[PDB]
Design a protein around this ligand. Structure first.
Ligand SMILES: Nc1ncnc2c1ncn2[C@H]1C[C@H](O)[C@@H](COP(=O)(O)CP(=O)(O)OP(=O)(O)O)O1
Ligand SMILES: [Mn+2]
Ligand SMILES: [Mn+2]
Ligand SMILES: [Mn+2]
Ligand SMILES: [Mn+2]
Ligand code: NA
Length: 313
DNA sequence: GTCGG
DNA sequence: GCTGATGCGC
DNA sequence: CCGACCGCGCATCAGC
């Protein structure tokens, strides 16, 4: 809230570069700037003050100067008013509609939610589900509901087999008071880096009607929809489940706890210490080093350990 | 769009 | 009917 | 001043 007007501005520019310009590196540049400014403990008075921060450069400092002077950004004003930009931006809020589908739709005059309904036969399964739950998927999930969801998943998992271990990661594990979705990391002793495990868990969650819909499902990843049992229905929620080798659990939990900016910052700092981190391993790239805890990974790269609650960048 | 090389 | 190409979310 | 900034699992379909 300290520099919220600035970070909101940079976030809206990011979304434009992602959805309309299809410029993913600019999208990420804007987000890294919004992130670093969010962390800045002073109220920003000038573009030059902001330019001191790593990731804020010449062009953002200028935009910051204009925002500070006028209270707005002319570039954003023009985008908002541009029918094609505005429509593409909008359509990409449907899960399953990305920059390419959005732009194709808009070129054919499909431009609003109603139009998508009028044309559901042009949508694939994922997009039809995105449309069906459009409002629900933009609602946040209160931590109290996440706690009930956790209990359902952790118990139904234990029903299928007691050696399974499910861990809710993402913003929940970082202790956020609300979450955009539910991210679940799954392990079983029989699946290691050598050695239907996911399908058994998915189908049970379907059996007790927690999982309502499927977006994508394979041997190691499930993307779908779930809903707490009900009164007014609870909203339908996005749920992601990943099955990962048990001996790669801690790299996995580190990664899927995030945040995504934190992961970016860690993989870059890793390189600055001779290491390379991914979702599965940490390597000097040579053999995967041994890991028994998240802190093991912090140690290797000489960072002070950070509890999950301190990785929300 | 930014920054280290 | 198959599959390389690519989109999507992450 | 110029390139790196992750790369992958899963679904779809244009082009044979
Ligand atoms: N592009 C990316 N680069 C690096 N790491 C990435 C990533 N996308 C996702 N991740 C990682 C970190 C997230 O915390 C985690 C879950 O990704 P997520 O898409 O569920 C976002 P989350 O952090 O859970 O907040 P929320 O909005 O859902 O409440 O997976
Ligand atoms: Mn999440
Ligand atoms: Mn989300
Ligand atoms: Mn997720
Ligand atoms: Mn990857
Ligand atoms: Na979308």
């Amino acid at each position: 809230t300290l520099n919220g007007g600035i970070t909101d501005m940079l976030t809206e520019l990011a979304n434009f570069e992602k959805n309309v310009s299809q410029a993913i590196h600019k999208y990420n540049a804007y987000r890294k700037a919004a992130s670093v400014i969010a962390k800045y403990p002073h109220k920003i008075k000038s573009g030059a003050e902001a330019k001191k921060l790593p990731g804020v450069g010449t062009k953002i400092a200028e935009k910051i100067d204009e925002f500070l002077a006028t209270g707005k950004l002319r570039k954003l004003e023009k985008i908002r008013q541009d029918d094609t930009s505005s429509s593409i931006n909008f359509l990409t809020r449907v899960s399953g509609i990305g920059p390419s589908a959005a732009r194709k739709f808009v070129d054919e005059g499909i431009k609003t939610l109603e139009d998508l309904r009028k044309n559901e036969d042009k949508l694939n399964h994922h997009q039809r589900i995105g449309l069906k739950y459009f409002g629900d998927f933009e609602k946040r999930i209160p931590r109290e509901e996440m706690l009930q969801m956790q209990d359902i998943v952790l118990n139904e998992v234990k029903k299928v087999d007691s050696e399974y271990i499910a861990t809710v990661c993402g913003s929940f594990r970082r202790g956020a008071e609300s979450s955009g979705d539910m991210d679940v990391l799954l392990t079983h002793p029989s699946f290691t880096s050598e050695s239907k495990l996911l399908h058994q868990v998915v189908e049970q969650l379907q059996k007790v009607h927690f999982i309502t819909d499927t977006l994508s499902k394979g041997e190691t990843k499930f993307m779908g929809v779930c809903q707490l049992p009900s009164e007014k229905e609870y909203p339908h929620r996005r749920i992601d489940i990943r099955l990962i080798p048990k001996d790669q659990y801690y790299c996995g939990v580190l990664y899927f706890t995030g945040s995504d900016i934190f992961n970016k910052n860690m993989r870059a700092h890793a390189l600055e210490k001779g290491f390379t981190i991914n979702e599965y391993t940490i390597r000097p790239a040579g053999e995967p080093l041994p890991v028994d805890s998240e802190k093991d990974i912090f140690d290797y790269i000489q960072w002070k350990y950070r509890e999950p609650k301190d990785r929300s960048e």
